[PDB]
C-alpha cells in the first residue's frame, strides 16, 4: 500500500546513506512550501547513538528526538533492526501539521539495540554551527526533495529553522 520512513536529523555524519527511494509515490509527509519545514515528527521516550546514530529505547519521557518523514523502505538490506509499524495517522506527534492524512500510514524508523551494559546518562544537543547546517542541506534536502533550489528561494529562511526546530537527546557514552 502506502508507506513512509522516519529519518533522524543528527549533527553527526550518520546521515549520508540511509534512504533508498526519493518519491515513492508523488508526495511525502514532510512538506516544505514557502514557509519552511512542516510535519516534523518527534519520537519521545527514545534517545540516539550518534556514532551510527540510532534509536536507543529509553523509558524517560524527557528524551525526544526529531526527524522528517518520507516514503520508502530503507536500502532493502534491513528490517531486522528497524521499527516497521502501522498507525492510523492520529497517534503520531507531528509538529507543524499543515494538511491532513487518510487515517492510515505505514512508517519505518531507524532503531538500535539498547546496548545493555551501561547507564544511559543522556544529554540533549542543539543544531548550531551553520557550516554543518550548510553541508547538511544537500545530503538530506536534495536527494530527497528535488523542489529545493526551484521553489525554495528562501534558503536563509529554511536555514534558521534547522537551528531552532530540530533537536534531540544523546547517550554521550
Partner 1 sequence: KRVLIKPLEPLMFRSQGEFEPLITGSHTAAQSLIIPRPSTIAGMLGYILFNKSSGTGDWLSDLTNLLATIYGTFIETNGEYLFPLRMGNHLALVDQQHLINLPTLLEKEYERREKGIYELFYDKNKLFQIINHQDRIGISIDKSTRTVKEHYLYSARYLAFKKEVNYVIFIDNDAISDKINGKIVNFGGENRIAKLEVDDYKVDTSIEEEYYLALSPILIPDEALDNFLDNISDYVAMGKVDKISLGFDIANTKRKEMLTAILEGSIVKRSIIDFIKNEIKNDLRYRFSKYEKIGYNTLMSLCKLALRKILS
Does residue number 104 form part of the binding site for partner 1 (CB under 8 A)?
no
Does residue number 93 form part of the binding site for partner 1 (CB under 8 A)?
yes
The binder of partner 1 chosen from 22, 38, 58, 64 (CB under 8 A):
64
Nearer to partner 1, 95 or 155 (CB): 95
The rounded Cα 27 to chain-centroid distance in angstroms is 16
Could you give the angle at which helices 157-164 and 130-141 cross, rounded to 10 degrees?
110
Residue with cell 536555514: 159
Does residue number 160 form part of the binding site for partner 1 (CB under 8 A)?
no
The rounded Cα 1 to chain-centroid distance in angstroms is 22
Nearer to partner 1, 62 or 147 (CB): 62
Stretch that binds partner 1, among 13-21, 78-86, 88-96, 153-161 (CB under 8 A): 88-96
**DSSP per-residue codes, 37-84:** B--EEEEETEEB-STT--BEE---TT-EEEEEEESS-STTS-SSSSEE
Spell out, one character per residue from 5 to 44, where the chain touches partner 1: x when CB under 8 A holds, - when not: ----------------------------------------
Give the residue among 124, 130, 141, 128 at the shortest CA–CA distance from 66.
124
Stretch that binds partner 1, among 29-37, 57-65, 79-87, 106-114 (CB under 8 A): 57-65
Which grid cell sits at 158? 529554511
Does residue number 87 form part of the binding site for partner 1 (CB under 8 A)?
no
State the residues that interact with partner 1 by CB under 8 A.
Answer: 60-62, 64, 90, 93-95, 97, 124, 164, 167
Amino acid at each position: 500500500s502506502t508507506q513512509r520512513e522516519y529519518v533522524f536529523i543528527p549533527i553527526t555524519n550518520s546521515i549520508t546513506i540511509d534512504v533508498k527511494i526519493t518519491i515513492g509515490g508523488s508526495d511525502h509527509i514532510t512538506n516544505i512550501d514557502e514557509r519552511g519545514i512542516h510535519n516534523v515528527l518527534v519520537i519521545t521516550g527514545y534517545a540516539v547513538d550518534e556514532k551510527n546514530g540510532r534509536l536507543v529505547p529509553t523509558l524517560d519521557p524527557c528524551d525526544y528526538v526529531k526527524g522528517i518523514l518520507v516514503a520508502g523502505t530503507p536500502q532493502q538490506a534491513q528490517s531486522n533492526d528497524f521499527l516497521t509499524l502501522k498507525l492510523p495517522a492520529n497517534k503520531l506527534y507531528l509538529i507543524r501539521k499543515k494538511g491532513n492524512i487518510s487515517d492510515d500510514l505505514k512508517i519505518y524508523i531507524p532503531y538500535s539495540s539498547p546496548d545493555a551494559r551501561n547507564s544511559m546518562k543522556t544529554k540533549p544537543v542543539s543544531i548550531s554551527d551553520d557550516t554543518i547546517v550548510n553541508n547538511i542541506i544537500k545530503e538530506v534536502f536534495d536527494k530527497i526533495y528535488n523542489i529545493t533550489q526551484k521553489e525554495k528561494v528562501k534558503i536563509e529562511k529554511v536555514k534558521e529553522d534547522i537551528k531552532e526546530l530540530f533537536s534531540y537527546y544523546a547517550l554521550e557514552q
